[PDB]
Ligand binder design. Structure first.
Ligand code: CLA
Ligand code: CLA
Ligand code: CLA
Ligand code: CLA
Ligand SMILES: CC(C)=CCC/C(C)=C/CC/C(C)=C/CC/C(C)=C/CC/C(C)=C/CC/C(C)=C/CC/C(C)=C/CC/C(C)=C/CC/C(C)=C/CC1=CC(=O)C(C)=C(C)C1=O
Ligand SMILES: CCCCCCCCCCCCCCCCCC(=O)OC[C@H](CO[C@@H]1O[C@H](CO)[C@H](O)[C@H](O)[C@H]1O)OC(=O)CCCCCCCCCCCCCCCCC
Ligand SMILES: CCCCCCCCCCCCCCCC(=O)OC[C@H](CO[C@@H]1O[C@H](CS(=O)(=O)O)[C@@H](O)[C@H](O)[C@H]1O)OC(=O)CCCCCCCCCCCCCCC
Ligand SMILES: CCCCCCCCCCCCCCCC(=O)OC[C@H](COP(=O)(O)OC[C@@H](O)CO)OC(=O)CCCCCCCCCCCCCCC
Ligand code: HEC
Ligand SMILES: CCCCCCCCCCCCO[C@@H]1O[C@H](CO)[C@@H](O[C@H]2O[C@H](CO)[C@@H](O)[C@H](O)[C@H]2O)[C@H](O)[C@H]1O
Ligand SMILES: CCCCCCCCCCCCO[C@@H]1O[C@H](CO)[C@@H](O[C@H]2O[C@H](CO)[C@@H](O)[C@H](O)[C@H]2O)[C@H](O)[C@H]1O
Ligand SMILES: CCCCCCCS[C@@H]1O[C@H](CO)[C@@H](O)[C@H](O)[C@H]1O
Ligand SMILES: CCCCCCCS[C@@H]1O[C@H](CO)[C@@H](O)[C@H](O)[C@H]1O
Ligand code: OEX
Ligand SMILES: [Ca+2]
Ligand SMILES: [Cl-]
Ligand SMILES: [Cl-]
Ligand SMILES: [Cl-]
Lengths: 34, 137, 334, 38, 245, 56, 30, 97, 37, 35
């Protein structure tokens, strides 16, 4: 099928950029003193 | 616009005579057509044979001619195919087949005239909607 | 204890991370079968002859669909309401052509979701709760029954069941509108009042409780930390919330009784959605929306259109184009 | 197909028997308060 | 014995089967050349559909390969009737007149390719060898028939395009160049010939009933000209009732 | 391939017949595009992607 | 690539459900 | 070189008159006296080399012949088009109102 | 569950982050030409 | 120019996956308790 050839990278970064943001914030929360 | 005596003036016969129906006759004609005919002929079409409609021009080209009161009254007594060739009372409501189409049992001659007048008057009002089917709804 | 006793104790145990229960004994296998078949079919199923006219419709991702166009396609009109399990097909290839996955999925799902409802009763009983959460769930459940079972029954085919897909859903909606004028049906109207009103009251309740949360935190922390799970004291001031809302409208239009409020929050969407479901389930037997086509006529008898007649024109468009190769006779009678 | 049919029949019967016998197994008493409901 | 009703048959699959004759039916049905005859019922029950594989450039001998039927027990031709002429050399010619003389059939090749066809004997004209003074288990009929387009002229593709109806262009690509889409936009109605052999295996000389095997060859669906059709060979069993008319 | 061809000639085959008796499968192995030492580290994908899908 | 991308996202969602259920922060009473 | 044969036929007399060899049977409703009796006969005995050959249908009454005579000016013949006569389309072409 | 005694914290200092990012970015700058081909 | 159509995403993921890994490790190191 003749899909938009930027759809893959658009989708990958749409997931990965905010997901990474959240994982960074989560892990550094856990590593804070209890 | 009004339902005038002119709108209600329709051909009686093939020889140029007309009859001017009263407003009560028009209303009766509508009621009676709904009662006995509209299950197949709603809006001037024919649901069980869409090739034949109740348009005035169609009725004019039927044999014998059905575009007048006498032709339509006769049709309701002894219906024929469009070419006049076969009598179809056994499969089309008629006074002749009132035994098998029981709604015809109570229709009087006056009532047939009213139904006939409705078939002729309605396209004068509705134009192409009459016999037009869904395209013109 | 003997084995059966032990087994019964485990099934009904209040200590399992996920409650099993007797309902769950039926729910778990049926939902897993429906899920596994759906996933595989949505990915990899070949085209399905939905309309029984040897015109196969592609629903799966591998056969040219995306998430929005994809579906598991209803079983063939040739089958109608006949039961078409795998073992009634000569082969899986035939089963697939004829839309066998649809039936397997919807039947396992409807059984499983019915048992999900039963399971909600069952756990409420084990935990000493009141029993009626399941009654609220009967609203979406009834709606799924309507579109996957009752409508097919009425129309005489699972081919007219809602497709299991996003675009398929819209197709079902547009054809339903053509055939039943659902928008003009008071039960779908109640359904709309139910979901628009459920959304309104959801936002309203959320906003009013959030408005009235008691100060327990500082500006550099989430107000959420001001509530601790299982604390005895209410966490917002209902008197303040009522003080607010009663002035927004007038006093006697606002609830000062939390129980009465929370009952209204349940009842409004549930009852509306029950009417939505009943709309679909009764249009299943072709008692349709209000028909005011040519209801307004002038002194001569000319038709004076209203907005109902304009709706009618749109509906006609849908009617004449839908399933464009399937009708041979002038009336669409089912 | 015949073997599949029979297998599914046996599977369904197995689970249905568990549901019925299970609810017959003193279900009213499986609650946290009053058990003597018989 | 039996004389089965619709309620005995319904849902069994027997409705898609041709009648059979028992093994004792090895007689001779005499033909009076002064008498006119009809086939009152011709029935064809296909048991195998074979599709000719399409080879790569090689010009190897392409084989007909087996396929899986996916449209269920909806394949037989039946209630066919027509004149059975006695010709001046003693050959018989069956001229098909009417009946349930086609079935759309879809079969599937290894790997998934679906092959629709209009399995048919429409306008069949089939003849025996000369001097057929009795129909016997040596009799055979060979003939030709017409294979019209699998879809008729009103059929609309998924984008609304058709021959006697529908759009005449790809309206979703309003400014695409039309030339590369011409084969999909301009629908064509195929009409080709097929060939069939009927080999009589059983004759009840008393009743005029004959049964045997057939093999037919014809083209499959071409999707109103959008693609090349496949060659299909159909094999099965037949039954005919011959009558003086 | 040469051995088969020679045996065919010696049995009275014409040259056309001798070479026509060689299986396409055998001939295709005697083509360097099927040699695994003709590739490239960053030339990705199936062999079909380079020389094409062999037809005949 | 399209199909892979859809299936990948779905499978991540399914894994998330697993972690959200079985590896949740446990709720603790005060 | 690809042609839609129905569109092409509309540029012949088929587009101007009742084609005795092709036109669907409802078209005979246009003129007095032709439908259904003569219409059926005409379709059944088609095709015709010329319009006048319609007069040679066996069994026509004298009245039928005269009706046919009066309507020849509204008839034509063109070569039979497979697409218009297959499917029983001359008897029902999928058009109602 | 009593806690697992084998757990240890993990560290990456700033200099290591910078070294690591340099490695990755330079490798990308090197290999990207071959990836595009 | 007719480049490989996966080079873009290959390069972006090559950079991003390991870079993110290191950023995650650095930030959670900084957020740890000091002496
Ligand atoms: C709880 C488990 C469970 C249940 C309830 C079902 C139920 C069903 N499956 Mg599924 N299935 C299951 C697990 C189950 N499945 C598992 C684990 C597998 C993998 C092996 C499958 C694989 C499978 C396939 C491949 C297919 C089915 C199909 C079916 C349907 C037909 C079943 C049938 O004909 O048996 C009928 C058997 C009986 C009636 C015997 C029951 C005997 C009891 C004692 C009598 C009581 C009957 C009474 C009416 C029930 C009500 C009791 C009530 C008062 C409590 C039905 C929706 C078919 C389908 O979906 O078709 C469209 C199908 O093709 N299933
Ligand atoms: C100003 C905008 C406006 C207003 C006043 C309404 C009003 C209404 N709509 Mg409409 N509607 C709108 C915009 C609006 N709509 C828009 C933009 C869309 C999308 C295009 C729709 C789509 C829509 C659909 C599809 C349907 C309605 C329906 C309704 C009715 C019930 C609404 C309901 O329960 O909501 C939730 C709100 C509450 C429960 C709060 C109480 C609301 C009432 C009406 C206040 C009474 C106050 C008093 C008399 C003064 C009501 C007459 C239904 C209908 O026609 O029923 C006959 C229906 O089926 N609406
Ligand atoms: C603003 C415009 C508007 C609005 C607000 C609505 C609103 C509605 N319409 Mg209407 N409609 C509209 C315009 C609109 N309509 C138009 C223009 C048309 C013609 C094109 C239609 C034609 C139409 C049809 C034909 C139908 C609707 C229905 C609905 C309802 C849909 C929600 C529902 O069924 O909930 C009920 C809830 C469910 C169906 C959910 C069931 C969930 C099951 C039990 C569980 C599923 C589990 C899931 C698979 C897994 C979860 C994931 C997790 C476990 C991980 C709702 C009342 C539907 C309805 O009334 O159905 C009864 C319906 O069938 N409408
Ligand atoms: C032993 C492992 C192995 C082997 C031999 C193959 C072999 C093959 N695969 Mg498979 N595959 C593999 C694992 C493997 N695969 C894995 C793990 C996956 C999941 C990602 C895949 C997914 C996959 C897909 C999706 C496809 C293939 C295809 C193929 C074919 C083409 C390969 C190609 O173009 O490579 C090209 C190889 C390279 C360009 C070499 C990469 C060199 C790297 C980038 C060097 C890294 C250097 C490092 C960064 C330096 C660090 C320095 C530091 C320490 C200082 C070939 C038959 C293709 C095919 O034709 O399928 C039908 C195809 O489409 N494979
Ligand atoms: C220029 C000039 C002339 C200026 C003069 C101006 C002037 C001074 C005027 C004064 C004179 C005057 C007043 C004239 C009036 C003219 C007039 C009538 C104007 C208004 C007309 C109008 C269209 C009014 C619209 C108002 C309207 C219909 C409101 C909606 C009523 C309605 C159905 C409300 C919903 C009721 C309901 C069921 C509520 C429950 C839902 C809900 C809120 C759940 C959540 C909830 C509730 C709680 O209760 C608490 C506690 C909590 C937690 C909570 O969750
Ligand atoms: C966690 C997620 C991981 C993130 C992935 C990060 C992606 C970047 C890294 C990938 C770069 C390599 C891909 C090359 C370009 C490409 O597009 O490939 C794309 C190719 C596929 O190739 C494609 O195939 C297609 C038809 O299927 C078409 O022919 C295309 O034209 C063709 O490009 O991908 C592969 O082949 C994957 C498998 C590679 C096999 C590797 C062999 C072993 C290598 C050993 C390396 C050892 C190094 C030690 C060093 C110390
Ligand atoms: C080849 C077969 C292929 C088929 C594949 C199908 C899956 C079968 C795999 C078998 C392994 C099962 C492990 C299950 C994990 C688990 O639940 O553990 C969690 C706990 C721990 O078990 C607890 O286990 C305890 C011991 S221990 O903790 O495990 O050591 C025990 O003491 C306690 O009583 C017990 O409940 O188990 C339970 O809570 C009870 C079981 C609940 C089962 C839930 C199924 C729900 C499915 C519904 C449909 C969803 C569709 C999916 C879409 C999102
Ligand atoms: C398919 C699934 C894929 C998942 C992928 C995830 C992969 C993650 C890859 C991580 C790699 C990270 C490297 C960390 C790098 C890093 O932390 O460096 C510094 C680090 C110092 O370690 P120490 O023992 O001092 O401990 C400090 C701690 O804070 C480290 O955690 O040393 C090493 O890691 C040894 C390797 C040195 C490598 C340094 C080379 C740098 C030279 C620059 C080269 C480019 C310039 C060249 C010019 C010509
Ligand atoms: C369906 C069961 C019908 C009902 C009820 C009525 N009519 Fe009818 N009508 C019907 C058909 C199928 C036809 C065509 C018959 C044919 O073979 O020619 C008709 C035809 C007519 C006509 C002639 C139309 C024309 O010449 O263009 C007329 C005037 C007519 N019908 C009138 C009529 C009346 C007045 C009815 C109620 C008393 C009535 N019809 C009922 C089918 C059906
Ligand atoms: C049309 C069908 C005709 C069917 C005719 C026969 C009627 C059906 C009879 C079902 C008999 C089952 O009888 C039932 O069995 C279960 C299984 O051991 C018993 O056993 C149960 O006892 C207690 C009851 O508080 C439970 O805590 C325990 O887990 C369990 O062992 C029930 O106490 C018993 O009442
Ligand atoms: C796109 C690619 C994505 C790549 C994803 C890579 C994910 C890597 C996860 C790194 C996990 C680090 O894991 C984290 O380790 C730290 C310590 O270092 C633990 O933290 C523990 O030690 C620290 C320091 O002594 C204490 O202040 C803290 O109270 C204690 O819990 C966290 O509880 C754990 O969440
Ligand atoms: C020679 C057999 C004579 C049979 C009698 C002729 C009329 S037959 C007759 O058709 C009528 C309509 O015309 C119906 O009213 C009636 O029910 C039907 O039986
Ligand atoms: C667990 C894997 C489930 C998916 C199985 C998919 C059906 S199997 C699939 O069928 C296609 C159509 O016949 C073939 O073209 C293809 O070669 C084949 O692998
Ligand atoms: O299929 Mn689905 O949709 Ca219920 O209507 Mn009739 O059928 Mn078909 O048409 Mn319209
Ligand atoms: Ca023989
Ligand atoms: Cl007309
Ligand atoms: Cl549709
Ligand atoms: Cl139909």
């Amino acid at each position: 099928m003749e899909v938009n050839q930027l759809g893959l990278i658009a989708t990958a970064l749409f997931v990965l950029v905010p997901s990474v943001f959240l994982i960074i914030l989560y892990v550094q929360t856990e590593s804070q003193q209890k | 616009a009004e339902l005038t005596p002119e709108v209600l003036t329709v051909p009686l016969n093939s020889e140029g005579k007309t009859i001017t129906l009263t407003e009560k006759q028009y209303l009766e004609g509508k009621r009676l057509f709904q009662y006995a005919c509209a299950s197949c002929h709603v809006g001037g079409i024919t649901k069980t044979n869409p090739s034949l409609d109740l348009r005035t021009e169609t009725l004019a080209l039927a044999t014998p001619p059905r575009d007048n009161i006498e032709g339509l009254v006769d049709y309701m007594k002894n219906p024929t195919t469009y070419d006049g060739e076969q009598e179809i009372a056994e499969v089309h409501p008629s006074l002749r087949s009132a035994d098998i189409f029981p709604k015809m049992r109570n229709l009087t001659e006056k009532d047939l005239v009213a139904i006939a007048g409705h078939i002729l008057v309605e396209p004068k009002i509705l134009g192409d909607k009459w016999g037009g089917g869904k395209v013109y709804y | 204890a003997n084995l059966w006793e032990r087994f019964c104790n485990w099934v009904t145990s209040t200590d399992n991370r996920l409650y099993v229960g007797w309902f769950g004994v039926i729910m778990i296998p049926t939902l897993l079968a429906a899920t596994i078949c759906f996933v595989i079919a949505f990915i990899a199923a070949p085209p399905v002859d939905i309309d029984g006219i040897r015109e196969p419709v592609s629903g799966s991702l591998l056969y040219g669909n995306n998430i929005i166009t994809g579906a598991v396609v209803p079983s063939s009109n040739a089958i109608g309401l006949h039961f078409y399990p795998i073992w009634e097909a000569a082969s899986l290839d035939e089963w697939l052509y004829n839309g066998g996955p649809y039936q397997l999925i919807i039947f396992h799902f409807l059984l499983g979701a019915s048992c999900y409802m039963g399971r909600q009763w069952e756990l409420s009983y084990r935990l000493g709760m009141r029993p009626w959460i399941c009654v609220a769930y009967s609203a979406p459940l009834a709606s799924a029954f309507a579109v996957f079972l009752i409508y097919p029954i009425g129309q005489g085919s699972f081919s007219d069941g809602m497709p299991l897909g996003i675009s398929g859903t819209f197709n079902f909606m547009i054809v339903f509108q053509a055939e039943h004028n659902i928008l003009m049906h008071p039960f779908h109207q109640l359904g709309v009042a139910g979901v628009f009103g459920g959304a309104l009251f959801c936002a309203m309740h959320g906003s009013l409780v959030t408005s009235s949360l008691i100060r327990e935190t500082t500006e550099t922390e989430s107000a959420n930390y001001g509530y601790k799970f299982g604390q005895e004291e209410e966490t917002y001031n209902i008197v303040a919330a009522h003080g607010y809302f009663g002035r927004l409208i007038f006093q006697y239009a606002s609830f000062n009784n939390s129980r009465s409020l929370h009952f209204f929050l349940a009842a409004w969407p549930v009852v509306g959605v029950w009417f939505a479901a009943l709309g679909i389930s009764t249009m299943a037997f072709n008692l349709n929306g209000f028909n005011f086509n040519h209801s307004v006529i002038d002194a001569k008898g000319n038709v004076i259109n209203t907005w109902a007649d304009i709706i009618n024109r749109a509906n006609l468009g849908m009617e004449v184009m839908h399933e464009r190769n399937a009708h041979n006779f002038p009336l669409d009678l089912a | 197909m015949e073997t599949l049919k029979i297998t599914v029949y046996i599977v369904v019967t197995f689970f249905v028997l568990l549901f019925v016998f299970g609810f017959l197994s003193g279900d009213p008493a499986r609650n946290p308060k009053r058990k003597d409901l018989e | 014995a039996a004389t089965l009703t619709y309620d005995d048959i319904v849902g069994t699959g027997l409705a898609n089967k041709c009648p059979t004759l028992d093994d004792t039916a090895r007689g001779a049905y005499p033909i009076d050349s002064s008498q006119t005859y009809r086939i009152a019922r011709l029935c064809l029950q296909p048991t195998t559909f074979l599709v000719k594989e399409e080879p790569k450039n090689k010009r190897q001998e392409a084989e007909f390969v087996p396929t899986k039927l996916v449209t269920r027990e909806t394949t037989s031709l039946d209630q066919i009737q027509g004149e059975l002429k006695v010709n001046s050399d003693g050959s018989l010619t069956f001229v098909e007149e009417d009946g349930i003389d086609f079935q759309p059939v879809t079969v599937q090749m290894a790997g998934g390719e679906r092959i629709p066809l209009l399995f048919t004997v429409k306008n069949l004209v089939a003849s025996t060898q000369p001097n057929v003074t009795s129909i016997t288990t040596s009799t055979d009929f060979k003939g030709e028939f017409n294979v019209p387009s699998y879809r008729t002229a009103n059929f609309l593709d998924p984008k609304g395009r058709g021959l006697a109806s529908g759009y005449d262009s790809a309206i979703a690509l309003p400014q695409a160049k039309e030339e590369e889409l011409a084969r999909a936009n301009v629908k064509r109605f195929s009409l080709t010939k097929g060939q069939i052999s009927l080999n009589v295996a059983k004759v009840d000389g008393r009743t005029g009933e004959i049964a045997g095997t057939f093999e037919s060859e014809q083209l499959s669906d071409d999707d109103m000209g959008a693609h090349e059709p496949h060659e299909v060979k159909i094999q099965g069993v037949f039954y005919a009732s011959i009558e003086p008319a | 391939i040469n051995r088969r061809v020679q045996a065919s000639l010696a049995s009275g085959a014409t040259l056309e017949e001798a070479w026509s008796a060689i299986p396409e499968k055998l001939a295709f192995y005697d083509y360097i595009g099927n040699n695994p030492a003709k590739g490239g580290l960053f030339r990705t994908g199936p062999m079909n992607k380079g020389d094409g899908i062999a037809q005949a | 690539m399209e199909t892979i991308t859809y299936v990948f996202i779905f499978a991540c969602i399914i894994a998330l459900f697993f972690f959200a259920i079985f590896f949740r922060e446990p709720p603790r009473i005060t | 070189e690809l042609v839609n044969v129905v569109d092409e036929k509309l540029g012949t007399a088929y587009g101007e008159k009742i084609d005795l060899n092709n036109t669907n049977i409802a078209a005979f409703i246009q003129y007095r006296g032709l439908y259904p009796t003569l219409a059926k006969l005409i379709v059944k005995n088609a095709p015709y080399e010329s319009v006048e050959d319609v007069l040679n249908i066996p069994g026509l009454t004298e009245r039928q012949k005269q009706i046919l005579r009066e309507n020849l000016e509204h008839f034509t013949v063109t070569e039979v088009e497979t697409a218009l006569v297959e499917g029983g389309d001359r008897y029902n072409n999928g058009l109602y109102k | 569950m009593e806690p697992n005694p084998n757990r240890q914290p993990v560290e990456l200092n700033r200099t290591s982050l910078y070294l690591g990012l340099l490695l990755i970015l330079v490798l990308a700058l090197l290999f990207s030409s071959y990836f595009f081909n």
